[PDB]
Amino acid sequence: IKFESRKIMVPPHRMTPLRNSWTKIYPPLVEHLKLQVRMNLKTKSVELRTNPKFTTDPGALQKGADFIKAFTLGFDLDDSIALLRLDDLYIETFEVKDVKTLTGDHLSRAIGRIAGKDGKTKFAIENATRTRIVLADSKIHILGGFTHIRMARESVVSLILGSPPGKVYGNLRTVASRL
Amino acid sequence: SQVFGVARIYASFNDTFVHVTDLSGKETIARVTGGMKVKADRDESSPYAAMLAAQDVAAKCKEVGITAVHVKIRATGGTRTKTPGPGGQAALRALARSGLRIGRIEDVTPVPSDSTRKKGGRRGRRL
Amino acid sequence: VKFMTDGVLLREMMHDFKLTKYSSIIIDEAHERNINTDILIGMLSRCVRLRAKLHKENPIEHKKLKLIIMSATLRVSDFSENKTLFPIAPPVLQVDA
Amino acid sequence: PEEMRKRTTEMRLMRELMFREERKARRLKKIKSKTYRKIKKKELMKNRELAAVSSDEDNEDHDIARAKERMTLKHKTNSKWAKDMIKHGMTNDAETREEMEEMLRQGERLKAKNPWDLLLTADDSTRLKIVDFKQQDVIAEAFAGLPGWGEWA
Amino acid sequence: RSKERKYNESNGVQSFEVGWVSKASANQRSGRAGRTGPGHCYRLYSSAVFEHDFEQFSKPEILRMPVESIVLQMKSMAIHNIINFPFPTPPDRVALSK
RNA sequence: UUUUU
Known about the structure:
This is part of a larger assembly, with 1 copy of chain A, 1 copy of chain B, 2 copies of chain C and 1 copy of chain D. Chain A is an alpha+beta fold. Chain A contains 9 helices and 6 strands, in the order E-H-H-E-E-H-H-E-H-H-H-E-E-H-H. In chain A, the strands form 2 sheets. Chain A has a 3-stranded antiparallel β-sheet with strand order 1-3-2. Chain A has a 3-stranded antiparallel β-sheet with strand order 4-6-5. In chain A, a hairpin with a 4-residue loop joins strand 2 and strand 3. In chain A, helix 7 runs antiparallel to helix 8. Chain B has one domain: 2-Layer Sandwich (Nucleotidyltransferase, domain 5), CATH 3.30.420. Chain B has a 5-stranded mixed β-sheet, with helices on one face. By secondary structure, chain C is mainly alpha-helical. Chain C has 2 helices and 2 strands, in the order H-E-H-E. A two-stranded parallel sheet of chain C has the order 1-2. In chain C, helix 1 crosses helix 2. Chain C is globular and about 40 Å long. Chains in contact: A-B, A-D, C-D, C-E, D-E. Chains A and B meet through helix 3, strand 4 and helix 8 of A and helix 2 and strand 5 of B. Chain C binds one RNA strand through helix 1.
């Protein structure tokens, strides 16, 4: 357990939620993982370090950094905590333009289709596929198990390509039953 | 007492590479890929494949004398996705657990100022 | 010598746990297995040990409490073999007539 | 003073807020699909009905509304739109027939003629102030059985 | 035969059912004779039914009815860990949970 | 059916 450090830059639009949730972020990092936590206000980057005399799990530092990173991407705290709890969760990230070059109102409607009315469609994918989805403008992040994120990705991509939400919803029930 | 190399991780859709080289990048120390550690071609991009590849290079690097590596993770980039996949994320975690000191982690994905056309076509791809 | 409902002892215990007023406590008709009776025996097992310990510490200030469980067709294992109730198995007396 | 800085921030939040409604309002403005607008209208009528936002109409209010309807007869099939759809076989379709019937029912509505809310505040103030422990816990005992914000933490 | 109140915890439905008494309960009924003189107990069921169908003892009171009052009282004792309380027969976890 | 401070 050698002295190591990680730096995770916080984008400005995630600083204020980081403030309100800081009380629930440093306890698990400093207690379970035995990590030395700090935020450099000058650089606005969360700094994590291994304490050689106290830290014991070699994977604590990287485990903590991914947890901070998950919150940074826009995932709620409790969902990010799942990265600390478990060891088999990964984040899939891809853009709308990667699937299809959509611009103007076509891009706006594609984002609206993925989220659905009142976010119903996004929750439908999240529940069926056992994953969490953050829809940041045209940037989509999916969190979950490796086999699970791929299933959610396919359901999302079908929506981008133009498949109506209703048909995608039925497909979610089928895979959900298989799960 | 502390020798640095560079650990290049190329996380594509259908495979993950873990390549460790000297600081310059000319000399290869150990290249292991997801395919060399799995029986079925479906699981080459699987995180489990990356972990085995990362552990193998970590063991090999310790034999050579390399004790720390700078991580330069990258995706396919170009006209395709720019963020490393879970195969790359898994490879990074395994390298940390291996005891090999992680110096600095940066994303070096090839990002185009503006690129050629994408292979999908007007209607898109990746059904 | 005072006859009373189980709930009366429960409340008097609410107000004074050591039952300093009493020299002995009789739980009659224990075969009925009443919920209140079960609670009282569970609490009194603990009380009597407490008062014996205090008597050992200071007999003049603190005195012992004698506990009697009275029943007809008791499943004696429920109260004799239950070590959580009584770490030492109490003696059992049978009236043969 | 530094209170001036506080004033600028409060204005900045208010400006950032007004933009957000403008962007959302601009986008909802462009969508003018009948199905989308129909769903929103239905949900709104439920909320207003459930919350009773609309005041009850007095008998005089109903009479005035009925008077105008009789004066005009604006909700019969002699209107330009209703006559246009009817005379040209466009009302045989289900959807345009619903709109015609919707119009007609709305017109019909206006044509119709021993001796034996105050929300309870369950806060601590409304309380029966009755008056009746550590040693009893000793009796139980005898039974047996922002940090790190800017500095390293 | 006795008409017992059975409480279905899963749905909170209360039912009254006529079922066989326990052997001890039957023995207690037979004991009502013999208090003032030699007496007889005429049972309207065969010994075959008695030995097989009759339970030895009826279920304790604690396992049949709600325990919300008892939990509150014990919590007022600062008996925080009711699970570790030395019960004669501990109550079911589900009943405690509700 | 019982039954309780």
